[PDB]
Design a protein around this motif. Structure first.
Motif, mmCIF file in Angstrom:
data_model
loop_
_atom_site.group_PDB
_atom_site.id
_atom_site.type_symbol
_atom_site.label_atom_id
_atom_site.label_comp_id
_atom_site.label_asym_id
_atom_site.label_seq_id
_atom_site.Cartn_x
_atom_site.Cartn_y
_atom_site.Cartn_z
ATOM 1 N N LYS A 21 0.850 -1.180 0.000
ATOM 2 C CA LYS A 21 0.000 0.000 0.000
ATOM 3 C C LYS A 21 0.890 1.235 0.000
ATOM 4 C CE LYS A 21 -4.092 1.918 2.281
ATOM 5 N NZ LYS A 21 -5.101 1.701 3.356
ATOM 6 N N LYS A 22 0.606 2.171 -0.903
ATOM 7 C CA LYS A 22 1.391 3.387 -1.039
ATOM 8 C C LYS A 22 0.479 4.600 -0.946
ATOM 9 C CE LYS A 22 5.069 1.415 -3.910
ATOM 10 N NZ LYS A 22 5.785 1.518 -5.209
ATOM 11 N N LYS A 23 1.102 5.759 -0.747
ATOM 12 C CA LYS A 23 0.392 7.032 -0.675
ATOM 13 C C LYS A 23 1.256 8.072 -1.373
ATOM 14 C CE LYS A 23 -1.857 10.219 2.591
ATOM 15 N NZ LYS A 23 -0.989 11.401 2.334
ATOM 16 N N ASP A 24 0.762 8.603 -2.487
ATOM 17 C CA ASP A 24 1.455 9.630 -3.251
ATOM 18 C C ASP A 24 0.470 10.737 -3.599
ATOM 19 O OD1 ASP A 24 3.055 6.987 -3.827
ATOM 20 O OD2 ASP A 24 4.429 8.610 -4.372
ATOM 21 N N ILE A 25 0.988 11.788 -4.224
ATOM 22 C CA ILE A 25 0.200 12.947 -4.622
ATOM 23 C C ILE A 25 -0.004 12.878 -6.128
ATOM 24 C CG2 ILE A 25 -0.007 15.446 -4.570
ATOM 25 C CD1 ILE A 25 2.394 13.446 -2.303
ATOM 26 N N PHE A 26 -1.260 12.956 -6.556
ATOM 27 C CA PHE A 26 -1.626 12.859 -7.962
ATOM 28 C C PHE A 26 -2.095 14.211 -8.477
ATOM 29 C CE2 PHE A 26 -2.006 8.490 -6.545
ATOM 30 C CZ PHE A 26 -1.440 7.787 -7.589
ATOM 31 N N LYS A 27 -1.659 14.554 -9.686
ATOM 32 C CA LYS A 27 -2.109 15.776 -10.336
ATOM 33 C C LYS A 27 -3.468 15.547 -10.985
ATOM 34 C CE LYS A 27 2.699 16.973 -11.410
ATOM 35 N NZ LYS A 27 3.679 17.293 -12.487
ATOM 36 N N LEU A 28 -4.361 16.521 -10.829
ATOM 37 C CA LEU A 28 -5.713 16.450 -11.369
ATOM 38 C C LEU A 28 -5.947 17.651 -12.274
ATOM 39 C CD1 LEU A 28 -7.649 15.388 -8.143
ATOM 40 C CD2 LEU A 28 -6.513 13.938 -9.837
ATOM 41 N N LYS A 29 -6.293 17.387 -13.532
ATOM 42 C CA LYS A 29 -6.562 18.422 -14.518
ATOM 43 C C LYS A 29 -8.060 18.509 -14.791
ATOM 44 C CE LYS A 29 -6.241 17.904 -18.922
ATOM 45 N NZ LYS A 29 -5.817 17.654 -20.329
ATOM 46 N N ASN A 30 -8.515 19.709 -15.140
ATOM 47 C CA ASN A 30 -9.899 19.954 -15.524
ATOM 48 C C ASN A 30 -9.944 20.464 -16.967
ATOM 49 O OD1 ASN A 30 -8.966 22.567 -15.286
ATOM 50 N ND2 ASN A 30 -10.267 23.115 -13.541
ATOM 51 N N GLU A 31 -11.125 20.929 -17.383
ATOM 52 C CA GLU A 31 -11.288 21.418 -18.749
ATOM 53 C C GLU A 31 -10.461 22.674 -18.994
ATOM 54 O OE1 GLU A 31 -15.492 21.969 -19.090
ATOM 55 O OE2 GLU A 31 -15.540 23.746 -17.796
ATOM 56 N N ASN A 32 -10.327 23.528 -17.982
ATOM 57 C CA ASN A 32 -9.594 24.781 -18.114
ATOM 58 C C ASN A 32 -8.081 24.605 -17.996
ATOM 59 O OD1 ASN A 32 -12.164 25.919 -18.240
ATOM 60 N ND2 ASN A 32 -12.193 26.409 -16.048
ATOM 61 N N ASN A 33 -7.580 23.373 -18.093
ATOM 62 C CA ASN A 33 -6.152 23.075 -18.007
ATOM 63 C C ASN A 33 -5.568 23.423 -16.640
ATOM 64 O OD1 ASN A 33 -4.138 21.797 -19.578
ATOM 65 N ND2 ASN A 33 -4.532 23.181 -21.302
ATOM 66 N N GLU A 34 -6.419 23.540 -15.622
ATOM 67 C CA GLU A 34 -5.983 23.861 -14.269
ATOM 68 C C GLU A 34 -5.615 22.577 -13.534
ATOM 69 O OE1 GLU A 34 -9.387 25.733 -12.610
ATOM 70 O OE2 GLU A 34 -9.430 27.383 -14.058
ATOM 71 N N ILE A 35 -4.478 22.595 -12.843
ATOM 72 C CA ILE A 35 -3.956 21.424 -12.147
ATOM 73 C C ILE A 35 -4.106 21.645 -10.648
ATOM 74 C CG2 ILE A 35 -1.941 19.991 -11.687
ATOM 75 C CD1 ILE A 35 -0.956 20.653 -14.513
ATOM 76 N N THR A 36 -4.823 20.735 -9.990
ATOM 77 C CA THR A 36 -4.919 20.687 -8.538
ATOM 78 C C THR A 36 -4.518 19.292 -8.080
ATOM 79 O OG1 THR A 36 -7.291 20.197 -8.722
ATOM 80 C CG2 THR A 36 -6.655 22.494 -8.319
ATOM 81 N N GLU A 37 -3.797 19.220 -6.965
ATOM 82 C CA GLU A 37 -3.178 17.983 -6.514
ATOM 83 C C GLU A 37 -3.921 17.401 -5.317
ATOM 84 O OE1 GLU A 37 0.814 18.666 -5.226
ATOM 85 O OE2 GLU A 37 0.273 20.258 -3.813
ATOM 86 N N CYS A 38 -3.891 16.072 -5.218
ATOM 87 C CA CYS A 38 -4.501 15.348 -4.114
ATOM 88 C C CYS A 38 -3.638 14.147 -3.758
ATOM 89 C CB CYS A 38 -5.922 14.882 -4.456
ATOM 90 S SG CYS A 38 -7.200 16.110 -4.131
ATOM 91 N N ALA A 39 -3.745 13.715 -2.504
ATOM 92 C CA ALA A 39 -3.023 12.552 -2.006
ATOM 93 C C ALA A 39 -3.973 11.364 -1.942
ATOM 94 C CB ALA A 39 -2.425 12.828 -0.626
ATOM 95 N N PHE A 40 -3.569 10.254 -2.555
ATOM 96 C CA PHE A 40 -4.408 9.069 -2.664
ATOM 97 C C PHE A 40 -3.637 7.845 -2.199
ATOM 98 C CE2 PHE A 40 -6.609 11.400 -6.306
ATOM 99 C CZ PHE A 40 -7.681 11.770 -5.520
ATOM 100 N N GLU A 41 -4.327 6.959 -1.487
ATOM 101 C CA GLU A 41 -3.761 5.681 -1.077
ATOM 102 C C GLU A 41 -4.123 4.627 -2.117
ATOM 103 O OE1 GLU A 41 -5.173 4.868 2.847
ATOM 104 O OE2 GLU A 41 -4.163 6.604 3.741
ATOM 105 N N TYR A 42 -3.107 3.966 -2.670
ATOM 106 C CA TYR A 42 -3.299 2.977 -3.718
ATOM 107 C C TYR A 42 -2.443 1.753 -3.419
ATOM 108 C CZ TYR A 42 1.192 4.570 -5.604
ATOM 109 O OH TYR A 42 2.520 4.892 -5.769
ATOM 110 N N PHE A 43 -2.734 0.666 -4.126
ATOM 111 C CA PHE A 43 -2.025 -0.593 -3.968
ATOM 112 C C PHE A 43 -1.246 -0.918 -5.234
ATOM 113 C CE2 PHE A 43 -3.464 -2.206 0.072
ATOM 114 C CZ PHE A 43 -4.636 -1.515 0.294
ATOM 115 N N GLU A 44 -0.100 -1.569 -5.052
ATOM 116 C CA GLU A 44 0.784 -1.875 -6.163
ATOM 117 C C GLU A 44 1.470 -3.208 -5.908
ATOM 118 O OE1 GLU A 44 3.611 1.162 -7.015
ATOM 119 O OE2 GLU A 44 4.147 0.308 -8.971
ATOM 120 N N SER A 45 1.890 -3.842 -6.996
ATOM 121 C CA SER A 45 2.593 -5.111 -6.920
ATOM 122 C C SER A 45 4.071 -4.883 -6.624
ATOM 123 C CB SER A 45 2.430 -5.875 -8.234
ATOM 124 O OG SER A 45 3.210 -7.056 -8.250
ATOM 125 N N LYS A 46 4.633 -5.728 -5.756
ATOM 126 C CA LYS A 46 6.072 -5.679 -5.507
ATOM 127 C C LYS A 46 6.844 -6.097 -6.752
ATOM 128 C CE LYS A 46 6.050 -6.433 -0.478
ATOM 129 N NZ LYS A 46 6.668 -7.216 0.632
#
Ligand SMILES: [Cl-]
Ligand SMILES: [Cl-]
Ligand SMILES: [Cl-]
Ligand code: NA
Length: 576
Positions: A21-46
C-alpha cells in the motif's frame, strides 16, 4: 498475520507477499487546463509486471472512502469499464466489483460487498450515465445487463468484443474472450485463472485484484487499436449500430415475455390426449402421431423449463453476432424454433394493463435485392406499388395486370424466389413442384429462366458479375463484412440481402429504444423480420406509430431507391 491480514481493513488478503500500500500525490486536470493535486492511497505489486498495462488500483470501501477520488472523472472522454460477478445469471448473482480505468491513473475499484453509503457511488453513476463519456467494455451486453438490473444507468458503449467479432468477418467461431483478444492485440497474457477464484466472499486476495485492475485498464489500449482497425476496414457504421444495439438487447432479455400457463397446461393435456388417442386407437396415423409427438416432447415439455416460476416469464438469450448473416439468434429457448401455429403462440401474452404491438416487413429481402442489383423494372414497379409477383406474372404470361389470375401469380412467386436467389431452370422445376405443387416441365422452367433474366437485366448483370469474380469477401449496405472459406454462388447472393436485413432490424431497435422512453415502452422480441414491443394500453395508438416509423426510418437509412412496407397490428397475444 503481519502479512496475510496486513490490509484486512481494506478487505484484502495478501496471499504471496506481493502487494504494498502506497500514498502519493496525484495531479488532477480539468477542462480549463488547471492542475490541482490530491493525495491518494493505492495498492501496487512488488514484482513489477512484464508489460505496460496499468496494474495499480484504488479500492473504495466505507472505511477509506476519499471523496477526492471522484475528481479523476473530471473532463474525461473515455474510460475502461469492467465488473466482476459471483456468477453468470444476472437474476441469481451479484456484482462483486466495478472497475473504472481512467487514462494514466491506477484503476478505481469499487468494493461492492464493503460499500453501504450511497454517496460513494454518486461519481460512479454520473460517469456511466454521461452520454459524452465512452465506456469501453468487453462483453457489453453481459456487463450492462448486471448494471441495469442493479439500478445503474449507462449510455455510450464501445464493446471490444463487438469490434473484434466484426473484424474477424465470421472466419472463426472461437477466440473472442478477453484473454484471447488481449494476447492478440497487446501480446499480454492475463491471469485467466482468477475467473475460477471465489468472488462471493467479502475478502479478495491481491492476485484477484491485480487481475480486476489489469482486465479493466487493458480496455484503454484495446480501444485505441480496435478503433483504428475499425476505421481502416470502414466498419464504423456497423460497429456503431452494434454498440448502440446493446441496450435494446438488454431491454429484451431483462423484460422477458410473460407466459399464460392456463393455455400451456391445457394444450399440453390436449396434445397429450391426442397422442394417447393415437396409441390406443391404432395399436395419416403416422404423420399425425409424429407431429403431435414432436409438438408435445420437443416443445410443450421443454418450454416449462424456462418459465420463471415466480413471474411466469421467459428470459431468452439473444446472440448479437453469432449468425453468419448478422441476424439475431436466440437460445434457451430458441424463439424462432417455437411453433408458429396460433394454437401455440397465443400462449405468450403481455403483462397486465399492457398490450403487444407487432410489426413486420412484407418483402424486405426482395426489395434489398432490387436495390443491390439496381434493376430498373423492379424498382419502378415497387415505386408504382405494383406487386412483384403480379409483375413477374405479366412478364411470363405477357398478360396485362387485369387479365392475371391467381394461378399466374402463384407460378410467379416460385419463379421470383427461385431465380432471385440463384437457381437454374432445373432447380426451379424441382423447387416449384416440391414447395408449390405445380408440376412444371423443364422446357417451361427454361422459358421462365430466359424470360426472367431477359427483362430483369439488372439482376442478370449482377448475378453474372458474382459468378465471374468468384469472390470470397462480401459486404452489406452497412458495410458489415464476411469472408467465405470457399466460393458458393447462392450464398454470395444471399449474404448481402440477409445481412442488410440484420442491419435494418438492428438499427430499428436502436431508434425504437430511444423513441419508446417517453411512454416507458418495452422491447420484447425480434425474430425474422418482425419486432414486438409492449406498452400500456393508453399509449396504444402512439406506440403503433413509433414502431412503424422506427422501422421505416431504419430502412430509409440503407435503401435509397425503394420504400419498405411495414405491416403492424395491435394484439393481446403473439398468435394474432
Ligand atoms: Cl470497404
Ligand atoms: Cl467505431
Ligand atoms: Cl418491405
Ligand atoms: Na467485461
Amino acid at each position: 498475520d503481519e502479512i496475510t491480514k496486513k490490509y484486512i481493513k481494506d478487505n484484502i488478503i495478501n496471499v504471496d507477499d506481493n502487494i504494498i500500500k502506497k500514498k502519493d500525490i496525484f495531479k488532477l486536470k480539468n477542462e480549463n487546463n488547471e492542475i490541482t493535486e490530491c493525495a491518494f492511497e493505492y495498492f501496487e505489486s512488488k514484482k513489477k509486471f512484464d508489460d505496460d498495462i496499468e496494474s495499480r488500483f484504488f479500492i473504495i470501501n466505507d472505511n477509506n472512502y476519499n471523496e477526492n477520488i471522484n475528481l479523476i472523472y473530471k473532463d474525461i472522454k473515455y474510460c475502461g469499464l469492467n465488473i466482476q460477478t459471483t456468477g453468470l445469471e444476472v437474476f441469481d448473482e451479484n456484482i462483486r466489483l466495478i472497475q473504472i480505468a481512467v487514462e494514466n491513473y491506477p484503476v478505481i475499484i469499487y468494493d461492492m460487498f464493503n460499500i453501504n453509503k450511497k454517496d460513494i457511488l454518486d461519481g460512479l453513476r454520473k460517469v456511466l450515465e454521461n452520454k459524452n463519456i465512452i465506456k469501453i467494455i468487453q462483453n457489453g451486453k453481459f456487463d450492462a445487463k448486471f448494471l441495469l438490473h442493479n439500478n445503474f444507468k449507462i449510455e455510450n458503449i464501445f464493446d471490444t468484443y463487438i469490434a473484434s467479432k466484426l473484424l474477424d468477418k465470421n472466419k472463426n467461431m472461437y477466440g473472442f474472450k478477453l484473454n484471447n483478444i488481449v494476447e492478440k492485440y497487446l501480446n499480454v497474457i492475463l491471469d485467466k485463472q482468477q475467473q475460477n477464484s471465489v468472488w462471493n466472499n467479502s475478502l479478495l486476495n491481491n492476485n484477484q485484484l491485480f487481475y480486476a485492475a489489469r482486465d479493466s485498464s487493458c480496455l484503454l489500449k484495446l480501444y485505441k487499436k480496435l478503433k483504428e482497425e475499425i476505421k481502416k476496414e470502414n466498419l464504423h457504421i456497423v460497429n456503431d449500430i452494434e454498440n448502440k444495439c446493446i441496450l435494446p438487447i438488454c431491454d429484451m432479455e431483462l423484460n422477458g415475455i410473460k407466459v399464460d400457463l392456463e393455455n400451456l397446461q391445457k394444450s399440453t393435456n390436449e396434445i397429450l390426449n391426442e397422442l394417447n388417442i393415437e396409441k390406443d386407437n391404432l395399436k395419416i396415423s403416422l404423420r399425425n402421431y409424429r407431429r403431435l409427438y414432436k409438438l408435445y416432447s420437443a416443445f410443450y415439455l421443454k418450454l416449462p423449463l424456462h418459465i420463471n416460476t415466480k413471474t411466469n416469464k421467459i428470459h431468452t438469450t439473444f446472440n448479437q453476432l453469432k449468425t453468419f448473416s448478422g441476424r439475431f439468434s436466440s437460445e434457451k429457448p430458441n424463439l424462432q424454433q417455437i411453433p408458429r401455429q396460433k394454437n401455440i403462440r397465443e400462449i405468450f401474452i403481455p403483462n397486465d394493463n399492457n398490450i403487444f404491438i407487432i410489426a413486420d416487413f412484407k418483402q424486405i429481402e426482395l426489395k434489398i435485392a432490387a436495390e443491390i442489383t439496381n434493376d430498373e423494372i423492379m424498382l419502378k414497379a415497387y415505386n408504382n406499388n405494383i406487386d412483384l409477383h403480379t409483375l413477374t406474372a405479366s412478364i411470363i404470361t405477357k398478360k396485362n395486370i387485369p387479365d392475371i389470375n391467381k394461378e399466374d401469380r402463384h407460378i410467379a412467386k416460385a419463379i421470383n424466389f427461385g431465380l432471385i436467389y440463384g437457381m437454374n431452370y432445373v432447380n426451379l422445376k424441382n423447387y416449384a413442384n416440391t414447395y408449390y405443387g405445380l408440376n412444371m416441365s423443364l422446357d417451361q422452367c427454361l422459358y421462365f429462366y430466359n424470360s426472367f433474366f431477359e427483362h430483369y437485366k439488372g439482376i442478370y448483370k449482377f448475378h453474372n458479375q458474382v459468378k465471374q469474380k468468384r469472390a470470397l469477401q462480401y459486404s452489406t449496405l452497412s458495410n458489415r463484412k464476411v469472408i467465405f472459406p470457399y466460393f458458393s454462388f447462392t450464398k454470395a447472393l444471399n449474404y448481402p440481402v440477409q445481412g442488410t436485413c440484420a442491419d435494418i432490424l438492428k438499427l430499428a431497435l436502436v431508434d425504437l429504444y430511444d423513441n419508446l422512453k417517453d411512454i416507458n415502452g418495452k422491447i420484447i422480441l425480434c425474430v425474422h423480420d418482425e419486432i414486438i414491443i409492449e406498452v400500456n394500453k393508453k399509449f396504444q395508438e402512439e406506440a403503433l406509430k413509433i414502431l412503424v416509423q422506427s422501422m421505416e426510418n431504419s430502412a430509409s437509412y440503407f435503401l435509397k431507391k425503394v420504400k419498405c412496407e411495414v405491416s403492424v397490428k395491435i394484439a393481446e397475444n403473439w398468435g394474432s
